């Protein structure tokens, strides 16, 4: 379990971002949902925050508590489990800053959102802020014929046997995996944005944030797009502290704050340089607690090579 | 139940050594399968069931408690083995068969050979479902161990916790020693003879034997030789047949998907060429969690550069 | 007619670059095949017809004049393309189809690109059988040439005939220069830039154009550089589609089954880096023997170590 | 065509053997059928033989004549074509020594035999000899699981497609190819022998030399035989000049005067070390001119591992 947290301590981007937020935190209370190993939680406590309540479900928080105790941090307390099961034990129940990365691969399908919204409605002071507060999704076209060959056509013959049924399982699944730059062959399109203050609660129905948005990208070269890839960014804009704002930006092909997700287009889309790949992204949350999501994608060429439109429904799961 | 996803099955099937080891074990001994009943314990996509059918088996029973059984049943049909291979969706412990099976094929091996392994299930099948002389594929399992130098990961996975943004995470460093590392050990890292850790006869082993003690000696070879960790690998010989095939996860062979299991010593051994260090390892299922492994390691080393006699524990969870 | 034997088809199918070049040329341009009629000239085992079918072709027609067509017809059925791929046994020149075909795929290339090649058969199919806009796979062909050093074979294939058991077989040495060598040229031997020999557009080339003249210059690159022979290779681009694929037999790529054609010069050229030697090659089918190639080569080299203007003839038989 | 003769000038075994025969040739006439490049022919002519008539169908004889003319050898004459088509112009038609390697991969399936017999019946002097005069065939069991995988199972799936029909074409073909020593896993059994003086004519029927002979070998180690391999040897014994005798012997796994042939057993035969692999070999000549041959083999174990008997018919062709 310890090794799984190394990525966090080497995340320079998040560290400088949340450090910019934790400048004005002295004397203010912090609620860190999904604190993980509690590195940012402890940095907030080290920033002389009045109180820091760090919550996560993994056992690492227990080790985090030990570390906190062994570093003289006395204004921080860790809680293991879902927020709903620990609020009753909370020392304080009104916070000035709530740090939570509630954004999923499609903006609305991270289980932590259900907890963020609870903290927004009950545990946030009148003038308190939440960090980050906005998230946009970006679409790009991807051309990886060999990856398709190695994940789909691979099942065409396995040691002499055809495993066609597996191809379905491959194409119905949203692939979370870094996509090489050489495979990015289109511009980027910001399709949708959500803000924590506008996000609807999910305790009654999980669909109150489902969205259908168009998108359009332009091929950067003569190519054939057989994958659509989705990147997530995050923004924090504090009107009271404008300088403390940050952006966990998106850079396809490079280091990103989240691993992009990809969907395999059932029919490749051949494009000329500059040709528009237009489409539509439909995202529906079915289970907030497990992040179960359906992603319906329509994508089409503009006709320079050939008029093609392809549709596909894909399934994503967190737990 | 994570086997209902395609990633794990693709990884195992693209493990050429693993799958071809089973294939060739059956196909170089096809005479062993003629007119025989084969049980594929954990058939997954059905690959091994089809190897057995293609080897000449009269009846193959692939059992798998995952939804992949559905796809397996379809795959079996797509290649014409519908009337030879039967795919059952369920636990091998909770299923009953018409006949006793003559051969049991299974890729039950986990990391460290026994972590999250189906060996208890295979033994259950052997005893309750297999003939008295049922043949196991594989029928032998040997674990081996050797010392390795790993300055890279000692600095990037343990000492990295000494200071993290001006905070002392030494506790994380101490906790890292509890959990073995599943990763590939390079030949250049082996600074020691491969010693036999333990051997199991799958035809005769009992669950109680899997909680094993082992006493092995490691001799430094080829001027300060650091044994930063113990690389544990295994091989599973298929000795049931006339032609012997051996699935091997040794670092001296190209990596499999099991790679190797690395037990990082709390106190690395500072040895010289020729010096020997004795070890006593006890592996046992974890008391509360049945599928977790407790590993106790006694290190006794006396050399020109160090004298250390200590006990260390690992927990594969 | 030797294609009724399995060896040649295995050789070609085990040639991964050749087969995947055709495979990819189609599957990266599958849009070109939707609802289209494909003709596979010389389908052999049918592999290319099945590539075309999987690409989305409405109808594929594989023609082959050898007995292999029987197996091909069974193979296409064994994989479920019976209703898409039709296998005809006969010469493409002597068959006629209901519709005009939209696409023509074929591996017609031989050694030297043109030795015993089916190119004339493919041109016949292009003219008579395909639509006016019919698309060729491959639709381009380019031969290249470069000088090479080959002291090894110069001593083991030519000078060895000087004295054989006390008998002067120099005549055999002189005859050896007439026969090109189909063998693999390693990068180590290339002491010259790869120059364009000739180019063919399969969309428009005519049989008369295959008896070609070429004027090419060769410049030594990087002691004394001996141009003992000329290595000739070819590549066939698939440019009919949006995604371009290129089948290549260059010596800078792993060998194909075509390897390279080596024309040994009667008088080796003594060059050093920078020097330039001009050549004029006329390749044409032998006047009487149709399917043998006569290669006239005029070598004109003027360097610091040699001045030679001579004519040499090669017969590819 | 010239390169095809390099094997001849390097064949020191044949070379020293035929040299031993050409010592006492001074004053005697020689007929070399299948002379090829005519190296042995010229060595005989240089030995002051009265006359040397060398024949072969390939154009190399024309080149050989040039060589002979440029080396001063005038007691030698080369003829191109079938023997029957060139005897009309022979200077002499009665020879003291007739050199002809009439033996094929199965002793009776070399087209040159039809010419050898003609020479035996019409062109041989009263006390003339024929060289070599005897040939035997040797059987060995071979274990090559990877070769079966690469040649038979390869067709199991070719780029995603099943090419089962091809497997048959592989296993019914006699393969001429050197077998590595590591794959020789049994003793050698001299199964049959034919002498040129005893070989029957082929003008009327082609089956007058077909033979059915048993064979028995002992496994040299625990192994599984899936191929049977056949080696050919030749012998020349001259009663008039016993010292000039020679043997073109055989050594499986090493250099041999001819490339062995192999047949793929349809069912592998597992054997323990020392176990007897017994069987029967049936050879039938269908077309002498083209060397078309059928080779039927029965092969069985002794049961030490498992009682298995396998039978197979295989096809060989020369032209
Ligand atoms: N107790 C149990 N009973 C039955 N099947 C089980 C089991 N525990 C695990 N399995 C199944 O056994 C499989 C083992 S992995 C499958 C390996 C497969 N034979 C191959 O070589 O590709 C998993 O797919 C899992 O679903
Ligand atoms: N003039 C002609 N007309 C029709 N078929 C021909 C021909 N000349 C040769 N062929 C056939 O064309 C084939 C070319 S080689 C086959 C290659 C095949 N596409 C593969 O990849 O396996 C041979 O099998 C031969 O039988």
Task: Describe the model.
- It is classed as gene regulation.
- The complex is a heterotetramer, with two copies of chain A (319 residues) and two copies of chain B (317 residues).
- Helix content of chain A is 18%, strand content 35%.
- Chain A has 319 residues and is an alpha/beta fold.
- Chain A has two domains: 1-132, no CATH class; 134-319, no CATH class.
- The longest helix of chain A is centred in the middle third of the chain and has 12 residues, at 111-122.
- Chain A is elongated and about 65 Å long.
- With 317 residues, chain B is α/β, with parallel strands linked by helices.
- In chain B, a hairpin with a 2-residue loop joins β14 and β15.
- The radius of gyration of chain B is 21 Å and the shape is elongated.
- Chain A binds chain B through residues 1-3, 5-6, 9, 15, 37, 39, 42-43, 46, 63, 66-67, 70-71, 151, 154, 158-166, 169-170, 173, and chain B through 5-6, 9-10, 13-14, 19-20, 23, 45-47, 50-51, 54, 70-71, 74-75, 78-79, 156-157, 160-161, 164-172, 175-176, 179, 181.
- Residues 3, 9, 12-13, 42-45, 47-48, 63-66, 68, 91-92, 107, 118, 121 of chain C line the site of one S-adenosyl-L-homocysteine.
- Residues 3, 9, 12-13, 19, 42-45, 47-48, 63-66, 68, 91-93, 107, 118, 121 of chain B line the site of one S-adenosyl-L-homocysteine (SAH).
């Amino acid at each position: 379990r310890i090794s799984g947290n190394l990525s966090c301590i080497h995340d320079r981007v998040r560290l400088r971002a949340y450090e910019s937020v934790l400048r004005s935190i002295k004397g203010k209370s912090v609620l860190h949902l999904g604190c993980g190993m509690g590195l940012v939680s402890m940095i907030a406590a080290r920033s002389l925050a009045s109180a820091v309540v760090a919550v996560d479900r993994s056992a690492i928080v227990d080790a985090a508590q030990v570390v906190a105790n062994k570093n003289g941090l006395n204004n921080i307390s860790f809680f293991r489990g879902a927020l709903v099961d620990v609020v009753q034990n909370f020392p304080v129940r009104q916070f000035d800053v709530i740090i939570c990365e509630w954004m999923g691969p499609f903006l609305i399908n991270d289980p932590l959102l259900e907890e963020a919204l609870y903290a927004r409605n009950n545990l946030l002071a009148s003038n308190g802020v939440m960090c980050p507060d906005s998230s946009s999704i970006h679409v790009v076209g991807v051309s990886d014929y060999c990856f398709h060959m190695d994940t789909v056509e691979f099942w065409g013959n396995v040691y002499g046997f055809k495993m066609e049924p597996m191809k379905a399982l491959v194409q119905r699944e949203v692939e979370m995996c870094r996509v090489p730059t050489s495979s990015i062959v289109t511009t980027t399109c910001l399709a949708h944005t959500v803000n924590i203050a506008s996000i609807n609660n999910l305790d009654d129905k999980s669909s109150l944030n489902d969205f259908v948005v168009p998108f359009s990208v332009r091929a950067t070269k003569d190519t054939t797009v057989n994958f659509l890839t989705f990147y997530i960014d995050a923004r924090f804009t504090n009107p009271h502290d404008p300088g403390a704002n940050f952006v966990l930006g998106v850079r396809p092909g490079g280091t990103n704050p989240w691993t992009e997700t990809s969907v395999a287009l059932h029919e490749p889309l051949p494009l000329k340089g500059g040709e528009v790949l237009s489409g539509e992204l439909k995202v529906c949350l079915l289970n907030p607690t497990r992040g179960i999501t359906t992603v319906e994608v329509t994508a089409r060429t503009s006709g320079n090579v050939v008029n093609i439109e392809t549709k596909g429904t894909y399934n994503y799961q967190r737990y | 139940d994570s086997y209902s996803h395609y990633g794990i099955h693709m990884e195992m099937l693209k493990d050429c050594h693993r799958t071809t080891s089973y294939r060739d074990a059956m196909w170089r001994n096809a005479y062993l399968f003629k007119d025989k009943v084969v049980l594929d314990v954990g058939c997954g996509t059905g690959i091994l069931s089809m190897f057995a059918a293609k080897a000449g088996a009269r009846k193959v029973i692939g059992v798998d408690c995952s939804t992949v059984a559905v796809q397996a049943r379809e795959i079996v049909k797509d290649n014409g083995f519908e009337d030879v291979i039967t795919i059952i969706q369920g636990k091998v412990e909770e299923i009953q068969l018409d006949e006793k099976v003559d051969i049991i094929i299974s890729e039950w091996m986990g990391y460290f050979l026994l972590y999250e392994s189906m060996l208890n299930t295979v033994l259950c099948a052997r005893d309750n479902l297999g003939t008295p002389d049922v043949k196991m594929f594989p029928d032998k399992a040997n674990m081996h161990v050797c010392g390795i130098t790993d300055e890279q990961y000692i600095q990037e996975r343990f000492n990295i916790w000494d200071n993290v943004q001006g905070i002392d995470f030494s506790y994380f460093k101490r906790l890292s020693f509890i959990e073995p590392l599943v990763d590939t050990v390079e030949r250049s890292q082996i600074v020691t003879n491969v010693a036999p850790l333990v051997s199991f006869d799958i035809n005769t082993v009992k669950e109680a034997d899997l909680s094993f003690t082992s006493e092995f000696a490691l001799e430094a070879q080829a001027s300060i030789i650091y044994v930063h960790a113990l690389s544990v690998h295994f091989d599973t010989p298929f000795t049931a047949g006339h032609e012997v095939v051996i699935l091997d996860t040794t670092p001296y062979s190209p990596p499999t998907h099991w790679r190797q299991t690395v037990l990082y010593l709390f106190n690395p051994l500072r040895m010289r060429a020729g010096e020997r260090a004795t070890f006593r390892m006890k592996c046992s299922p974890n008391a509360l969690n049945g599928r977790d492994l407790d590993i106790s390691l006694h290190v006794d080393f006396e050399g020109a550069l160090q004298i250390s006699h200590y006990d260390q524990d690992f927990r594969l969870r």
